[PDB]
Write a protein that binds this DNA or RNA. Sequence first.
DNA 1: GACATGTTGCCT
DNA 2: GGCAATCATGTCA
Length: 211
Amino acid sequence: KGHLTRLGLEFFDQPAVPLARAFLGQVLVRRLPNGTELRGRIVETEAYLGPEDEAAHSRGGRQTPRNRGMFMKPGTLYVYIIYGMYFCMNISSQGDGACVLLRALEPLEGLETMRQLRSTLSRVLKDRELCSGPSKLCQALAINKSFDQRDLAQDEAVWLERGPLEPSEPAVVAAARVGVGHAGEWARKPLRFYVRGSPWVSVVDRVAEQD
DNA sequence: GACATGTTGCCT
DNA sequence: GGCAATCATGTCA
Ligand code: NA
């Protein structure tokens, strides 16, 4: 572990699909103002191909003030507000307009602070409820629009770390993305990836699992 | 401007 | 499953 050991920019410079899959198993680290560090192992991701992808904010190569991050160098964060109250953390991948979306993390360190963050934002929250969602994880790790357009490879507040080796590569399920019905043909492209059997994924795809 | 629309969690 | 919530943001003009 350690900031010094964060994945560099040669890691993020890959096409959306390979990048999205390569993210699985890595560890997202967040350093809080009090110095505490929050860690979550990435278990769910989504690829957004860009220009072509009709689900991507960059369909038609349309670059707007909001999505600049997607057109910035790989590793560039793109955090946007959805439903006027939630955040979505994306990492720009190779290809102007392409990026990866984080949908779920396996809480590894700072669970209480995450619980605190998620609860304040009754009924007590269980760990399964901390980062099991694109917007849940953003609240749990105190990620917001202020992180938009920063560099995941060079930032003192957030970085990615190599996950542990693992004596059997994790089985990955490729499924349709969540909440992209408005994308016609692209709505069903298997551009969503997660760790098979993981109890931290936000949405399972029984069908996709038996494919 | 005027108008349309993109996750979480309560509801029965 | 159905749906309210809450509003930033993009398009049209
Ligand atoms: Na990109």
